Amino acid sequence: AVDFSAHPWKAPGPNDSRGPCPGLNTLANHGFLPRNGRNISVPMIVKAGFEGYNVQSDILILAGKVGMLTSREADTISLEDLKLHGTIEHDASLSREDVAIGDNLHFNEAIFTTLANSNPGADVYNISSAAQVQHDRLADSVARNPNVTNTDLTATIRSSESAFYLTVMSAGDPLRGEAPKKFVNVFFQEERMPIKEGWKRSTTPINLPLLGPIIDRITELSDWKPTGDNCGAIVLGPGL
Amino acid sequence: AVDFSAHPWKAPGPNDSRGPCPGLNTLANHGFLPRNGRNISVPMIVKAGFEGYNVQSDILILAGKVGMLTSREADTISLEDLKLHGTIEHDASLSREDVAIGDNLHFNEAIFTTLANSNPGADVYNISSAAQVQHDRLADSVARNPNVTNTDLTATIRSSESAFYLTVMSAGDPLRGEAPKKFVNVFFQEERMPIKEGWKRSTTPINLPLLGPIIDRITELSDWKPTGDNCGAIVLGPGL
Ligand code: HEM
Ligand code: HEM
Ligand SMILES: *[C@@H]1O[C@H](CO)[C@@H](O)[C@H](O)[C@H]1NC(C)=O
Ligand SMILES: *[C@@H]1O[C@H](CO)[C@@H](O)[C@H](O)[C@H]1NC(C)=O
Ligand SMILES: *[C@@H]1O[C@H](CO)[C@@H](O)[C@H](O)[C@H]1NC(C)=O
Ligand SMILES: *[C@@H]1O[C@H](CO)[C@@H](O)[C@H](O)[C@H]1NC(C)=O
Ligand SMILES: *[C@@H]1O[C@H](CO)[C@@H](O)[C@H](O)[C@H]1NC(C)=O
Ligand SMILES: CCCCCCCCCCCC
Ligand SMILES: CCCCCCCCCCCC
Ligand SMILES: CCCCCCCCCCCC
Numbered sequence: 001a002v003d004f005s006a007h008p009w010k011a012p013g014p015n016d017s018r019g020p021c022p023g024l025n026t027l028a029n030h031g032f033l034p035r036n037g038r039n040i041s042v043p044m045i046v047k048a049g050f051e052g053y054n055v056q057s058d059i060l061i062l063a064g065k066v067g068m069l070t071s072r073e074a075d076t077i078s079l080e081d082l083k084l085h086g087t088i089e090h091d092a093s094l095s096r097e098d099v100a101i102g103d104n105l106h107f108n109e110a111i112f113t114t115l116a117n118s119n120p121g122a123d124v125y126n127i128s129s130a131a132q133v134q135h136d137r138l139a140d141s142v143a144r145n146p147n148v149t150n151t152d153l154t155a156t157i158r159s160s161e162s163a164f165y166l167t168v169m170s171a172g173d174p175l176r177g178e179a180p181k182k183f184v185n186v187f188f189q190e191e192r193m194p195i196k197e198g199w200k201r202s203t204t205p206i207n208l209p210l211l212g213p214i215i216d217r218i219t220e221l222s223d224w225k226p227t228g229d230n231c232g233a234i235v236l237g238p239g240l
Numbered sequence: 241a242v243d244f245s246a247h248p249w250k251a252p253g254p255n256d257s258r259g260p261c262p263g264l265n266t267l268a269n270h271g272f273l274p275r276n277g278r279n280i281s282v283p284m285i286v287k288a289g290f291e292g293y294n295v296q297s298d299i300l301i302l303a304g305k306v307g308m309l310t311s312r313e314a315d316t317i318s319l320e321d322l323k324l325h326g327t328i329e330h331d332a333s334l335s336r337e338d339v340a341i342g343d344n345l346h347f348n349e350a351i352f353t354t355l356a357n358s359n360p361g362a363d364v365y366n367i368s369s370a371a372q373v374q375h376d377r378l379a380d381s382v383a384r385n386p387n388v389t390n391t392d393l394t395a396t397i398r399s400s401e402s403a404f405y406l407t408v409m410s411a412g413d414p415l416r417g418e419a420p421k422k423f424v425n426v427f428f429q430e431e432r433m434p435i436k437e438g439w440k441r442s443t444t445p446i447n448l449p450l451l452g453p454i455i456d457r458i459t460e461l462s463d464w465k466p467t468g469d470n471c472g473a474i475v476l477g478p479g480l
């Protein structure tokens with residue numbers, strides 16, 4: 001059914017739509033999603049995320065339908081549409097700059113330094129390192145971004161994203177909440193599945209029951225606190 | 241051309257899905273949407289709203305994709321899913337009870353009394369009557385529902401809904417912001433297009449540019465103020 005050898009990595013061209021999400025960009029760069037990054041529906045995302053990563057429909061339907069709000073189309077997006085600030089896209093990203101003081105769309109190596117340097121002395125990233133990175137990235141946004149938004153919702157989304165890189169890029173059981181640095185680094189820096197380096201699609205389904213306790217533990221270890229508004233309101237569509 | 245003779249009203253059966261929205265219920269009762277009220281996509285809503293009412297894609301795409309959040313499916317809903325409180329469904333409805341103190345799903349004649357009795361001495365409802373109804377419905381919820389939610393967002397949705405019945409059920413130019421009581425009453429009470437009573441689909445497109453000034457004027461005349469935190473956060477999916 002799914003043949004990874006028939007899904008080679010190819011660099012996106014200059015008119016291939018790419019977004020702020022390394023998960024979806026990586027699927028597109030391997031043809032699990034359309035390589036042009038356009039006309040993508042939630043069914044397409046569900047199937048691509050299952051085939052590529054063994055991520056289940058529960059989280060992809062929930063996230064996907066929120067992502068659909070970022071376009072002007074009835075049932076599709078471009079991947080670039082997802083950069084719409086305050087729908088899903090948030091400050092204190094792991095690999096992108098805050099929209100008020102920089103580029104909220106493209107991989108940025110200087111931002112990524114915090115993650116790349118985390119968990120000193122080990123060859124994996126794990127739940128405690130992930131939490132430390134989140135704490136540090138939010139401190140960076142509070143220090144440098146006069147428009148910073150930090151809410152219960154953005155904090156949960158951020159922990160979700162960390163749980164994603166820990167699980168989808170895992171070597172063994174994604175339950176363990178740890179992933180080889182060499183796999184995660186390739187994922188973010190090149191938006192490529194690190195097949196050559198020894199990565200394989202998880203044989204364990206990654207769903208909400210699995211991710212939940214990981215998300216909550218990342219949040220707990222990150223020493224997160226409310227800083228201001230705390231209204232979990234999302235942007236419901238472009239140009240409002 | 242649209243043939244309404246090909247789209248007769250039929251009462252919903254006991255396992256036909258129906259929701260809190262008279263607009264979409266009415267389209268289903270005429271087969272513009274599936275009579276069973278199930279497996280409804282945003283494209284289906286766009287086409288049905290155009291064919292039945294001359295409502296354009298701008299508002300239906302925006303509202304439709306928010307409505308999709310209420311189901312567990314990738315790109316469809318059942319009409320009943322739309323009852324999900326705090327996505328679109330709100331307190332101080334025109335024809336339904338608040339969820340905390342009653343049934344937020346079915347037409348309720350006692351609630352509907354306020355609208356049915358508005359604009360005394362005219363045979364139309366109009367912008368000032370619609371505003372008075374909204375003021376009175378909200379006051380009712382504030383008096384009887386200690387859990388009332390009333391925010392910039394719910395207030396905008398409410399004025400949008402009033403603008404819809406004023407425009408879609410109009411006799412002449414929907415621009416005028418007035419509709420025969422005999423048409424509107426059938427719309428709410430029977431969820432039927434009042435063809436027998438003389439109604440015809442608008443020949444003027446109903447879109448955001450047309451609705452916007454009507455919405456804003458209803459709001460202005462309604463002497464509205466927020467309740468509590470005024471947080472415009474929506475519920476992003478069922479069972480959270
Ligand atoms: C419905 C599916 C998905 C949608 C709509 C989606 C959307 C997004 C968006 C909008 C962001 C930017 C958040 C920000 O940093 O400001 C993002 C980030 C991220 N997504 Fe996805 N995503 C989805 C699925 C996935 C999958 C399957 C993975 C797999 C690992 C993933 C991993 C990530 C990671 C690691 C980030 C963090 C990037 C950063 O902080 O620099 N996502 N996602
Ligand atoms: C197509 C034209 C539409 C018309 C004419 C229309 C009309 C209305 C009206 C008049 C109400 C208020 C009922 C009341 O307060 O008792 C209402 C409520 C509602 N409509 Fe629609 N609607 C339309 C489209 C939509 C769409 C596309 C969605 C979502 C996909 C939607 C979802 C709802 C919901 C959830 C409510 C419940 C709000 C509440 O009263 O608590 N409607 N609609
Ligand atoms: C998107 O894909 C659908 C089939 O899934 C196709 O009919 C449609 O034309 C495509 N959209 C565009 C704009 O190319
Ligand atoms: C993460 O790895 C570091 C270094 O190996 C270790 O000290 C720490 O206990 C680990 N944390 C978790 C949650 O496994
Ligand atoms: C961001 O903050 C600055 C300085 O506090 C202020 O001038 C500006 O209005 C803010 N911009 C936004 C996006 O609200
Ligand atoms: C609505 O109708 C009433 C009675 O005919 C009238 O007094 C009122 O001015 C009308 N308002 C608008 C906005 O047309
Ligand atoms: C109403 O709000 C209060 C807030 O103090 C809360 O305790 C209660 O559970 C709410 N009731 C309902 C019906 O949810
Ligand atoms: C990209 C993160 C997923 C966004 C989905 C919003 C709902 C809350 C977070 C998902 C896990 C609880
Ligand atoms: C008939 C009820 C739906 C119409 C209005 C919904 C608009 C969605 C939210 C956008 C900001 C108000
Ligand atoms: C959210 C969809 C309905 C919006 C209509 C209310 C305001 C219209 C004019 C305001 C200018 C931005």
Ligand SMILES: [Mg+2]
Pocket residue numbers: 020089090091092093096097098104
């Ligand atoms: Mg970001």
Ligand SMILES: [Mg+2]
Pocket residue numbers: 260329330331332333336337338344
């Ligand atoms: Mg209601």
